Amino acid sequence: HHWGYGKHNGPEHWHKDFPIAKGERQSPVDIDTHTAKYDPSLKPLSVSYDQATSLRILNNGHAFNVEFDDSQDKAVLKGGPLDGTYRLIQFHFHWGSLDGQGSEHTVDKKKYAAELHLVHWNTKYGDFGKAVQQPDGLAVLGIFLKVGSAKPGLQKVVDVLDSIKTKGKSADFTNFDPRGLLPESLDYWTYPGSLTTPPLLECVTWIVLKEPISVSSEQVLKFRKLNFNGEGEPEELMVDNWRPAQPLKNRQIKASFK
Ligand SMILES: [Co+2]
């Protein structure tokens, strides 16, 4: 049926409509820190978000997306394992019903409360729709969230969520600075993988930061008040919208640090 994260249409069902779900480079994965190889040939990441133009926030029935103007090189990711320039198109989170789960990637099987995905597309391909058809089409920056002190830069997001409680609702969301969601260190792990939602295309260079950000219990509880359903349908809280770890298969995770 229409895919989601429930008992009958969750991740274990996706392969029936999207056979690539059992592919050779699916995401997310467990990051075994002892096994990842330090790769001194790797460059530092270049995150250049100073001219980012946020536009809107949308509840799409799976998560909420903060969308950006990607019609110019305003907010880009370069360097690290990447060739060329990748433009920020949107960010979103995955989170749990409880603080013990919610992330998609895991680190030595540790699950974080949530995971932020900053999604960027390779410019060489002109638009997002074309980029997802290419093995180097997307670069997604993954950042773990743990529960502890509040993240000041996240509060503007948390506060608009009650205006987009249900599927299909959107709201204006301008002048948001995504630099306020980054941890101090840009040390990372990287590997080739996929989108973690249908259509699960194998088009992503994943860059997962080692350092988590902290958010407060109150901030994540507001995430969990969102809904998967549309307005005036039975309430299904938007929680546990994460895909579990997939087989690593023939892939190597590289580390940018020692
Ligand atoms: Co995601």
UniProtKB/Swiss-Prot annotation:
Zinc. Can also use cobalt(II) with lower efficiency, but not copper(II), nickel(II) and manganese(II). Changing residue 60 to T: Reduced activity. The active site is at 62 (proton donor/acceptor). Optimum pH is 6-8. The record marks 5, 60, 65 as: Fine-tunes the proton-transfer properties of H-64. Changing residue 140 to H: Impaired activity. Changing residue 140 to G: Weakly impaired activity. Changing residue 197 to S: Enhanced p-nitrophenyl acetate esterase activity, but normal CO(2) hydrase activity. Substrate binds at residues 196-197. The record marks 90 as: Involved in the binding of some activators, including histamine and L-histidine. Gene3D superfamilies: Alpha carbonic anhydrase. Its EC number is 4.2.1.1, 4.2.1.69. InterPro entries: CA_dom, CA_dom_sf, Carbonic_anhydrase_a-class, Carbonic_anhydrase_a-class_CS. Transmembrane segments: none annotated. Zn(2+) binds at residues 92, 94, 117. Disulfide bonds: none annotated. Belongs to the alpha-carbonic anhydrase family. PANTHER family: CARBONIC ANHYDRASE (PTHR18952), CARBONIC ANHYDRASE 2 (PTHR18952:SF120). Interacts with SLC4A4. Interaction with SLC4A7 regulates SLC4A7 transporter activity. Interacts with SLC26A6 isoform 4 (via C-terminus cytoplasmic domain). This is Carbonic anhydrase 2.
